[PDB]
Paper text:
[name]-10 (PSE-2) is a class D β-lactamase that was originally described in the late 1970s and confers resistance to cefotaxime and ceftriaxone but not to ceftazidime. Natural and laboratory-selected variants of [name]-10 have been identified, many of which differ in the spectrum of β-lactams that they hydrolyze. Class D β-lactamases share the same general structure with conserved motifs, including an active-site serine 67, a carbamylated lysine (K70), and a stabilizing and invariant tryptophan residue (W154) within the Ω-loop. Both protein structures contained two chains in the asymmetric unit, corresponding to a dimer, as previously described for [name]-10 (14, 24).
One such variant, [name], contains a single amino acid change (glycine to aspartic acid at position 157, G157D) from the [name]-10 parent. The [name] variant has been implicated in clinically significant resistance to ceftazidime. In chain A of [name], the Ω-loop was closer to the active site, and the indole group from tryptophan 154 (W154) interacted with the carbamylated lysine 70 (K70) (3.2 Å), as was described in [name]-10 (14). The interaction between W154 and K70 is critical for both the activity and the stability of [name]-10 (25). In chain B of [name], K70 was decarbamylated, causing an open confirmation, consistent with what was observed for the heterodimeric structure of [name]-10 (14). The Ω-loop conformation was maintained, and the hydrogen bond between the indole group of W154 and K70 was present. We observed an increase in nitrocefin hydrolysis for [name] as the pH value increased, suggesting that K70 was more stably carbamylated at a higher pH. Overall, [name] hydrolyzed most of the tested β-lactams more efficiently than did [name]-935, specifically penicillin-G, cefepime, cephalothin, and cefotaxime.
Numbering used by the authors:
A (entry chain B): 19 to 91, 103 to 265
B (entry chain A): 19 to 265
Amino acid sequence: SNSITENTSWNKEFSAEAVNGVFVLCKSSSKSCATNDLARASKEYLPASTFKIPNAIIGLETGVIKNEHQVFKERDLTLRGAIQVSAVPVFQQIAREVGEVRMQKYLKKFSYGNQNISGGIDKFWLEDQLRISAVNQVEFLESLYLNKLSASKENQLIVKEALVTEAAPEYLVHSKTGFSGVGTESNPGVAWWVGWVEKETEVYFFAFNMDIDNESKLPLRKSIPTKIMESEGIIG
Amino acid sequence: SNSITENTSWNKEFSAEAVNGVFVLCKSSSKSCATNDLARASKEYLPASTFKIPNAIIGLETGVIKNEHQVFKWDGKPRAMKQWERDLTLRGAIQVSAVPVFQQIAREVGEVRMQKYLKKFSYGNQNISGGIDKFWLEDQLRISAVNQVEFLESLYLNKLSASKENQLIVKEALVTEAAPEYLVHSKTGFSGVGTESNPGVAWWVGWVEKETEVYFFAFNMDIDNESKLPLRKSIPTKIMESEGIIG
């Protein structure tokens, strides 16, 4: 069995910046998750570039992505290079070569959100038909961490290393940002930060999302979760 | 086939700190390497904890290390450093240089398998004599900075005689710095202080993966005082910063 609890110890991190959002933090050894908002933790949002995680695994499994050091046979762009920069055309052509049938098959195997890829093969992760919750993101990342997705162990290891974003002697942070855009005041955009931390022998999975109606607030997608995980003694 | 070229453009990074040492830097591949000291670049030295890289690969390929998520449990007995007195992951044991974890891996691998893999890996003089749990710390095993680059390039390319999975597990365990522009994979080593006339050796070896290019590096220096240990990272870091590789 696994569990989730709602806490209030992190509410001060959101209200100080007037941010509507959710953080989900799961400790692997205890199979326990904590969140500031159970309803928003289960609410499905378009994934935007957090979709580069399953798209990279599917691209490698289908053979569309050549290897860790060269996406396609920029010409010498590495998989990590494509995940960091926007690389809009790169993941568009990966999705096109994968195709709707195989993309649908793998998102069902991965239990990835509502699995609705309607709206166009090269932009459905932005069309707002495909949606995934913060809880679903941490479940998906735990499966990737354990090499339990329906993909080769090698391809899961390649994507795990490509997602490293911070390294310290005591921990490794794997993460991915996403941003749908600013939307409007009545219908704001969504900004994500999802990932996990390998800290000594413990592993912490996390997923953050927030309403955003101004790119001015974009830095908060990393600063709020960073402050929570620093207060928990996980990073920093 | 491979060429080693000696330049003087990094000599001030060494003379400013009164350090006798060598830096080897290769862009893309080991086909062309640059160094401050052609003779020292190929001179073989005790690997010390840089040996944890092949030892980890061999531990995984022999099954002594069961898998990626292996935890090395602390039995509660005294260890030489307090940071080793705890359960450790493979990355944890590598990052804190937990000698006793790797001594037990070496004992379980055994002399016959250890010799076989160092021959497959072309790992320096491949001399493992003197004690299965200390040959890389105080005996006759020797490897040069150029050989370290060649070995790390093979690992980067998944060309060592080991599964691709096991090479990927060790490569992720070696990550030491991450930035949007690059990942640094690296390992330090320090044989000990020796004496003023017969100093020890300190190492920093690794590689830097950028968006479209890779750089392999190996540094070693004479050291007779622990106060000089920080130079094993500061000299090569200053060189790679001046080359626009990191920072």
